Each structure stands twice: as structure tokens, then as C-alpha cells.
């Protein structure tokens, strides 16, 4: 009833503990490397911001941020006897020149007040500044997201600022947060103003993705967080590689996301997590003994026994005929250290400092490792020829790993993280039975309105009539069932009196149609082309 109001608020495990104690180590190393890169960025920008004593001292120094996320916060030197006021401009803050100027002036004046404890929002505040605050001024401008700001406005604003260089008690510096493509910027500004910025620039880069010095490094840290405690099939690694390669800017965040989600899936369905440590060998159950039978390693090794051990008696006795002996036979191979991780770290740090190789990916390296093509991997640089036999690692086919690992064979994560958003809808709409199981008659003999309308929808051309479709749907409409269903409710009076209307079929047809086309506009499929006309419409989506 009231719901039509606007956002009216309402004011009303051992496996899990291992999830905690390990997931938290994972996130701990994550946040460690995160703060490392963050302090790195702050440090480099603070360093480059100063010490560049350019004898001209009549042009503000510019600091470009190549590939900048535009989210990088900035700090400044306290630097007593001179205010260091930061100014940040957003492409939203920039409707014109005048309002940019005023917003910036108000911001910097409020900052001078907070540092200070009637003024014109203009350039006068600059030269009066000393007289009005004592210390000399040094501001820095941080255009948050430049690519979208109308460069004529920004250009005019910079030419405006240029006038401030006739006071000598202030100095300015610019911080361009270009999203990318320095060429894009130098394509739009007036060349005469570029020649004003080009006095002392610094093409400092800010990109989480650069030589993977953070990417490969966090990948390696993850490898360490998962060492000797689980596995990851080649399918998993190649899927990670693929989905990473299509997400340029933020690979790392998404990488952590997918790894954590896989871990959550495991620790919420896998029952053998309790069996990476011997302290829970007593955590075994008879049903757990049953489920440790259906393993693919189990059947493969049963077949290997039947083949190699020609005497079937040992294999039969070690089989279900014993349970303690069987579980000992299982836990026998539970301690396969899987040097794959060890030799992986080995070759990693090796080609990091012995060969000192940078423009590479440890992810696909580990992929090749599990494959064994690591030779056709290291070959890429022609510097491990002397080492491909000391960095040599044939992939080992560990056993029983089919219980302590993670692979996307059911696509649960893929479908839940990277769904086919339009394809899923088209499927579940047209099909609708795999989800949908007195009045059951019509549901069993006539599809839900949505899908049975979607299917007529499908054969429609680019521009369609409302009423042509209305009639083609009337064809689909069983009047016999419509009278079966309307009078199926005698308990209501008004609905009964409705039920005897002789032209009720086409009326209810228009009713159902004008509810369906209604609810199929906010869903995006159909577009009510030319509101105030609504004589025809267009089918936006096609299957494809």
C-alpha cells in the first residue's frame, strides 16, 4: 500500500573455522601487498612532487598519471611557513570556467581557514592571501577524471591560472589523472597551452597492471597461501588467465575476488577440507568413508591395481572388505607434498633474480608447469637454454588430489560471477519449465504469460504493430480455458458478474496484453517507441 513512497526505510563448523583461519591468512597477505603498493604510489608521487628546482620558476610543474585509476588519494608535505593546499576538480564540478574558478576558490579558502582558525571568491584571494594568512601559498590541482571534462573549459581555466604567476608569493602545480592515452590529451588542448605545460612535466605511471611486479607477486603470494594444502587443476588456471585477460585496468581486485569465491565454494561444499591436516583423521565418518569411494583417483587406481596386480586377492581384500585398512590405503598418499608449488616458487625467484626476467606472467607459467610445456614457455626469451635442465620440471601426476583441489567443472562460479545476462533471461523465459513445476489445469496446458508471449515476440520483425501482435496473441489465447478459469471462482460476486460478459474473451485479452507489454518495458525487451503515439513498437533484443 504505502510502498509507493520513496525509499521509506524500515527499522525492524570445524570446516568453517578452518575457512576462517586460512581465508584470513589469504586476505592478510592480500592486504599486505595492497598497502605495499599504496605506500609505493604515495611515496613516488610525494617524491616527484618536489626537489625539481626548475630555474624558470614561472610555470607550474605538471605531473601526469598515466593509466591513472583517478581514485589515487594524494598527500602533501606539512611544510610549515607555507600552506600546502590540495585542490581536486571533478568533471562534474566543471560546468564552465567561472564555476570551476569559484568552487576551487571556495575550497582553497576553506582549507586556508582550517589551517588558519568577506573574501572574494576570485584570484584576488591569491595576492591578498599572504596579507590575510601570513604564510606564502603553494596549491596543487588534482583534476580527478580529465578525459570527460570539456577540454575547451579546462584550457580556458589553465590560461586563467597562468595570470597568477605575477605575485611570486604563490606557486602552483598540476596533477593530471588521465585515464589513459597521453596522446588523447595532447590531441584536444590548444598547442599554445601544451607549450605552457611542457615546461617541466613527468610521465609518472600509476597502473596496478605493469610488468605484473604486483600481479605476478600477488599470484605468487597466493600460491604460497595455498601451498601443500590443496590443488588447482589446469582448467582452473586457464579460466583465471582468460577472465583476467579481458579485464585490463583492475586485474588484481578481480583476481582476489574469484580466488576467494572459489575458496568459499570449496569450504561450503567440500567435506574433505578437514583432511589437509592429520589432527582430524579421527574426524572420519562411515558416510565419509563411503563418499571417499566415488573419487576419480579412486576408480583410476582401482583399475591400475586390477591391471598391474594380476592377483585380484590383494586388491579385493584392500577393497571395501576392509574399512580401516581401506582408509589407511587412502591416507597413504595423503602426504604428497606436490613440489609443483615448490619448484614453481623455485623457477619463479630464479628467473626473477638469476635470469632477472620481468615482462612475464607467473600464472601462465604455473599453467605450463601443470602442463609440462614449461620449456616452450621459458624458450620465449632464449636465456634458460643453459638452465632448462636445472630449472627443469616435468609435471608430476600426483594421486588422490581429486579431493583436495578446486576446478570449475560445474561452472557454478562462472555462472554466478560471469553470467550470460541476456542469454540466461531468454532461456529461462522461453523454456520456463525447468524452473516452474484447482487451477493447475491451465498452468499445465498453457504456458506462463511471460514465455508464451516471448515466443510470439520472437517471430516479430524490426518494427511491429501493437494490435497485430495483440491479435496474433488472441490466437494463442484459449477462450474455452479463459471461461474455465474466470468462472472457476464463484466465491467472488463481482468476478462472477465479470465472468458472464459475452465479449469477455477479447477484453481479458487486452487486459493481459496491456499488463504484459506493461511489465516488459522496464525489463528492457520491448521499447515503447514514440510515447504519446504508441501505435507501433520495436523489439530491442534478439536471440543472438
Amino acid at each position: 500500500a504505502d510502498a509507493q513512497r520513496s525509499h521509506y526505510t524500515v527499522y525492524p563448523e570445524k570446516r568453517w573455522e578452518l575457512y576462517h583461519q586460512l581465508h584470513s591468512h589469504f586476505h592478510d597477505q592480500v592486504d599486505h601487498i595492497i598497502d605495499n603498493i599504496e605506500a609505493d604510489l604515495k611515496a613516488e608521487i610525494s617524491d616527484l612532487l618536489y626537489s625539481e628546482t626548475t630555474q624558470k620558476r614561472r610555470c607550474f610543474n605538471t605531473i601526469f598519471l598515466l593509466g591513472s585509476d583517478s581514485t589515487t588519494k594524494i598527500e602533501l608535505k606539512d611544510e610549515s611557513s607555507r600552506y600546502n593546499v590540495l585542490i581536486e576538480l571533478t568533471p562534474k564540478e566543471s560546468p564552465n570556467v567561472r564555476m570551476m574558478l569559484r568552487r576551487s576558490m571556495y575550497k582553497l579558502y576553506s582549507a586556508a581557514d582550517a589551517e588558519e582558525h568577506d573574501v572574494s571568491y576570485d584570484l584576488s584571494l591569491v595576492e591578498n592571501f599572504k596579507r590575510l594568512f601570513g604564510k606564502d601559498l603553494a596549491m596543487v590541482f588534482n583534476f580527478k577524471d580529465v578525459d570527460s571534462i570539456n577540454f575547451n573549459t579546462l584550457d580556458n581555466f589553465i590560461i586563467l591560472l597562468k595570470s597568477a604567476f605575477k605575485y611570486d608569493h604563490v606557486k602552483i602545480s598540476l596533477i593530471f589523472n588521465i585515464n589513459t592515452n597521453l596522446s588523447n590529451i595532447e590531441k584536444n588542448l590548444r598547442q599554445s597551452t601544451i607549450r605552457l605545460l611542457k615546461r617541466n612535466y613527468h610521465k609518472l605511471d600509476v597502473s596496478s597492471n605493469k610488468g605484473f611486479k604486483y600481479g605476478n607477486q600477488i599470484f605468487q603470494s597466493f600460491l604460497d597461501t595455498v601451498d601443500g594444502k590443496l590443488n588447482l587443476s589446469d582448467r582452473f588456471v586457464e579460466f583465471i588467465l582468460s577472465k583476467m585477460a579481458n579485464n585490463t585496468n583492475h586485474n588484481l581486485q578481480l583476481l582476489t575476488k574469484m580466488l576467494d569465491y572459489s575458496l568459499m565454494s570449496y569450504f561450503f561444499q567440500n567435506a574433505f577440507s578437514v583432511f589437509i591436516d592429520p589432527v582430524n583423521v579421527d574426524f572420519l565418518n562411515d558416510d565419509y568413508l563411503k563418499i571417499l569411494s566415488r573419487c576419480p583417483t579412486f576408480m583410476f587406481f582401482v583399475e591400475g591395481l586390477i591391471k598391474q596386480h594380476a592377483p585380484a586377492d590383494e586388491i579385493l581384500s584392500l577393497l571395501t572388505n576392509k574399512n580401516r585398512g581401506l582408509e589407511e590405503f587412502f591416507v597413504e598418499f595423503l602426504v604428497r607434498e606436490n613440489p609443483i608449488n615448490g619448484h614453481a616458487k623455485f623457477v619463479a625467484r630464479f628467473l626473477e633474480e638469476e635470469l632477472n626476467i620481468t615482462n612475464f606472467n607467473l600464472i601462465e607459467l604455473y599453467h605450463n608447469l601443470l602442463i609440462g610445456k614449461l620449456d616452450s614457455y621459458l624458450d620465449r626469451w632464449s636465456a634458460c637454454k643453459e638452465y632448462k635442465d636445472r630449472l627443469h620440471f616435468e609435471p608430476i601426476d600426483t594421486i588422490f588430489q581429486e579431493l583436495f583441489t578446486l576446478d570449475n567443472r560445474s561452472g557454478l562460479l562462472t555462472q554466478s560471477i560471469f553470467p550470460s545476462y541476456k542469454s540466461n533471461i531468454e532461456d529461462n523465459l522461453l523454456s520456463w519449465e525447468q524452473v516452474l513445476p484447482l487451477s493447475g489445469d491451465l498452468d499445465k496446458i498453457m504456458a506462463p504469460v511471460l514465455g508464451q508471449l516471448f515466443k510470439l515476440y520472437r517471430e516479430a520483425n524490426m518494427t511491429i504493430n501493437i494490435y497485430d501482435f495483440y491479435i496474433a496473441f488472441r490466437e494463442t489465447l484459449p477462450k474455452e480455458e479463459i471461461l474455465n478459469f474466470i468462472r472457476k471462482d464463484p466465491s467472488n460476486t463481482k468476478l462472477l458478474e465479470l465472468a458472464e460478459t459475452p465479449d469477455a474473451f477479447d477484453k481479458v485479452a487486452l487486459i493481459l496484453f496491456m499488463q504484459a507489454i506493461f511489465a516488459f518495458e522496464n525489463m528492457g525487451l520491448i521499447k515503447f517507441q514514440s510515447t504519446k503515439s504508441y501505435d507501433l513498437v520495436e523489439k530491442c533484443v534478439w536471440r543472438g
Binding site: 513512497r5 516452474l436 506462463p448 487486452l510
Partner: protein, 328 residues
Amino acid sequence: KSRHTMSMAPDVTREEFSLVSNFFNENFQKRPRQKLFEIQKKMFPQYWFELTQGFSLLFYGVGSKRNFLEEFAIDYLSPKIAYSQLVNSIPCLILNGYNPSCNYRDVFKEITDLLVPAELTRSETKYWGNHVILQIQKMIDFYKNQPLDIKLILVVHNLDGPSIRKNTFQTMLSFLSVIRQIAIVASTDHIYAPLLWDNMKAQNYNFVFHDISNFEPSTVESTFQDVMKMGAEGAKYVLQSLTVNSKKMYKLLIETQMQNRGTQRTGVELKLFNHLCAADFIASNEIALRSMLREFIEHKMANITKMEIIWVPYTYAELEKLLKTVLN
């Protein structure tokens, strides 16, 4: 180019329409709906364990979520997970995204007081220089060093709403959802949902997706939207409130325009129309005639083209209905 025009359609009064929609939507596929719902309710501890890691839960799948949205959120998630923390059940911040009167400024003014007012952050309130974004930046710097537990659960109905989808509102909600101590769960209807977020906004959201298809009639959503039924019937009430002279002159018009769906060929010429409304002694001249005509025209109650044809675009059926019911 004779196309089927919605004019030639069996109209249904608002009462009959509403009531049959009620009957259907409350009885069409009940047993399917309840079977589906009792089946999918088993997923709720899965949502619990997923939101334990603050993964913003986005819900797609055909049919309205609003009912199911408030159902999962208000009744299961909030109080159970509140008890699980170790006391007011965490205020469920429901966003009526379908309501186009939602604005980032005021909803954040609410959010502020919902969130920790540990300091007089009102002192940071300033000029139009948006302290929404700066203050939320500060709030994030604060929460970066705060303990990890949900202190408010916000849920958006139809994240593709006419207001929330505004890119400013979207970015605000992104920088919001960056906060760890809040659980973000919402849903959309626009099939083009992924068009909304770049890798920056995805990184902010960390969206995890789930399908929910229960094939609802979109009750509340049918309310805010509106179609041509939501003119002939417009004038039908007008003529019910007029003067007897107007009644008679429109009666003569409707006879001479229905004699020949009421098509334009069937109308009359204003020359002969004046001849008639002067013969039966109704109209004194052309000025008073056109005056007592424009009262129909000034509400678009009759059509006129060119002969001087005044043709009622209202259907022959509806016209003779006016005759037999309200005129005679």
C-alpha cells in the same frame, strides 16, 4: 496501409481491469510460485555465507523481486544475522528504486545519521561543494580501521530504477558499497544491467550474481508506469457534465457524423451544420456556433479536417453508445 490500430480494441474499465488482474496474479500459478519459493528458500544460508564476505548480492531473473526482495531481506537475513553477531534488528534500508522521487542528497542525509555520527561531522557540511562524496570518502577512511560486522543492511528494488540508474546516483552507491561493514543486496529488471558498471564500479561493487525467476506480475512496478489506458472515454465524462443546449448540439453533430468506428467520411460540413443548427433554431450565427463548439474542441472532444468536415474520431460503437445511453 490498413494497420490494426489499438483504437479498434475492446476497452475495459479500470475496475474490471484491476479486478481481473487481481484474480489472475493472485491465482494464476499459485502452486508453482509456492513450490518455487519453498525450494529456493533453502538457498538462504548460502546467501548468509556469501554476504559474510560482503560480496554485493545482485539478483536477476524474470519476475518482480520486490515482494521476494523484502521477503528475503526483512524476514530472514536481518534479524538472524543480527543474532548471529553474538538490540534493535539492523534497520533494513529499503530503496524504492521504482519510485522516481528518490534523490542521492536526501537519502545520504538519512544514511549519515544511520551511519556512525562519532564526531560532529555536520561541521564538515559546506556549500553545494558535494560533501556527499567527500564525506563518504572520509567515512571510508574511518571504516578502513573499524571492526568487521554489518551495521546496516541496505536493499535496492530495481537497481535500474529511473533515479538510482542516474550515473551520479550510481557512482555514489558504488563508493558507498566499497564500505565493508555494510551489506549490499539489490536487483534490477533492465536486461542491460551490465552496461551500468565499468571495472572501476565493478571493483567498487564486487558484484556476485544470482538468478531469481518466479514470474511475478510486477505489482508495485505496474503502479508507477502508465500506458494509454492509464480521448473517447475522456470526453465521455465531460459530456456527462454540460448544458442541455450543448447536449442537443452534440446530439445533432453525432447524428450527422454517424449517419454516413466513426470515420472521417461520415462527418458533416460546417455550412450544412450551421444550416441545421439554424433550421431547428439552435445556432444564431457562426460565432456562437463555433463558441459552443470549441468547448468540445478546447478539451479535444471532436475532430475537424477538410468540405468542412467535423468528424468524431470516437468509434461508431462508442458513438451510438453515447446516443443510446447518455444522450437520449
